[PDB]
Amino acid sequence: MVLSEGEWQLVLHVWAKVEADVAGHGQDILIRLFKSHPETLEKFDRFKHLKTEAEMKASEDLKKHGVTVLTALGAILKKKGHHEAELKPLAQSHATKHKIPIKYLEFISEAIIHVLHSRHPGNFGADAQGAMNKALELFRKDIAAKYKELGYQG
Numbered sequence: 001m002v003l004s005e006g007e008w009q010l011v012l013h014v015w016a017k018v019e020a021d022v023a024g025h026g027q028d029i030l031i032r033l034f035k036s037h038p039e040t041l042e043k044f045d046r047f048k049h050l051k052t053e054a055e056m057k058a059s060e061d062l063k064k065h066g067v068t069v070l071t072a073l074g075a076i077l078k079k080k081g082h083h084e085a086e087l088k089p090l091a092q093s094h095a096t097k098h099k100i101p102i103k104y105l106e107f108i109s110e111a112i113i114h115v116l117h118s119r120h121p122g123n124f125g126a127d128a129q130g131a132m133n134k135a136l137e138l139f140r141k142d143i144a145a146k147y148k149e150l151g152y153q154g
């Protein structure tokens with residue numbers, strides 16, 4: 001699959017708003033993820049003890065993680081599909097150390113879309129949401145191919 005330049009621009013124009021407060025968007029996204037799919041929290045030996053949204057919002061380590069995740073994703077999006085270099089180390093750590101199935105990447109993709117839709121109705125209409133879905137699908141497809149090369153079922 002390949003996105004058009006117009007699709008990339010819709011993706012990057014909403015990402016520009018995310019970048020006003022990457023930390024806040026990261027918290028909202030991780031919390032949505034853990035609330036919708038509580039099993040995903042079990043992957044974080046650092047965070048699996050957090051019991052409530054309140055505890056999640058007050059966690060500095062969780063905030064730090066959201067910034068790390070969104071900054072990595074932002075870098076990948078900015079490559080506009082030319083993301084092999086960024087994807088290599090990410091695919092290896094997530095296949096081999098963290099053991100994150102593609103299904104869980106689908107879950108966080110859903111959380112991203114939900115938070116953007118809630119926070120950014122001005123820049124996340126149907127067309128922009130479609131473009132973001134296409135970008136995240138491409139990310140997941142490319143990660144999935146790497147998983148396979150690396151020996152992980154995903």
Ligand code: ZNH
Pocket residue numbers: 040041043044045046065068069070072073089090093094098100104105108109
């Ligand atoms: C979209 C998307 C995404 C992105 C971009 C990311 C990114 C990332 C980064 C950058 C980091 C740091 C470095 C490495 O590699 O290690 C990480 C880590 C990581 N991660 Zn991940 N992620 C993700 C998804 C995910 C999910 C979904 C999960 C689960 C479920 C995860 C789990 C993880 C973990 C567990 C870790 C580690 C943490 C700590 O701190 O230790 N993850 N991550």
